[PDB]
Amino acid sequence: DKEYIPLPPLRDMQDMSKVLFLLSTDKKRYPDGRHRTLDYFRASVEMFVTEVRQEYKRQYQQAQRGGRAMQRFTWKNSGELAICFACCCDNVKLLYDSLQPGPLKPLWDAFVSQLAPMLIIQSRVPEMMLSSQTYHTKYMDWVKGGNVRFPSVADRRVKVETYLRSG
Incomplete structure (x- = not known):
């Protein structure tokens, strides 16, 4: 029978906009290992955050070595x-599809719109260099x-699985 990830309790409903964050980060309510689709999504986020951080540092250091500004994130x-x-996009879709259906489940557009803001905050790469508009x-x-x-x-699924198995 169809098993779904339960939606997180929200206090004031406007917090619908934080459902993806709560799923991704609340390890008490959603522990690693409990939900496969969430595990694969969290892995894709970790992979992306590691890479975006590294690439930003690489571009920033190139600029510093060259005695010039880093004008933008390439x-x-x-x-x-x-x-x-x-990978993040693939797995945020699989995550979405595994969420308990019904009235409290956000619409896809509103759910996927949560991805870039979360990646921005988690990555700590300045939005001046890498904007929400670029993510769109x-x-x-x-x-x-x-x-x-x-x-x-x-x-891409194999890539995520390899990361989970081997770092």
């Missing part, structure tokens, strides 16, 4: 960051789909 569409972001462009690239061969959804 997000190439074929690299590791792009792949990890696609990348989300829309994921929706629209397709040099080097960008991994399939299946290959």
Whole structure:
């Protein structure tokens, strides 16, 4: 029989906008290992946050070594960051589909809109360098789909599984 992830208690309803955050971070209500779709999503977030932090540091240090400002965060569409972001999108959709259905379940648009704000806060990469508008462009690239061969959804699932198994 169909098993679903329970929605988190919200205090004032306007907090609907924090459902993704609560799912992702509340380890007391949602412990690691309990819900496969959430475990794969948390892994994709960790992978992305690690990569975005590293790439920011790499670009910032390049600028410092060159005695110049870092003018913007460059997000190439074929690299590791792009792949990890696609993993986040894949798994936030699988997470969404596993949430208890009905009136308290947020609509998809409102749920997926929570992803970029969370990644921004968790990553601590300055929004001046990497904006919410850039994240939207990348989300829309994921929706629209397709040099080097960008991994399939299946290959991206293997990537997340490898991370869970091997770090």
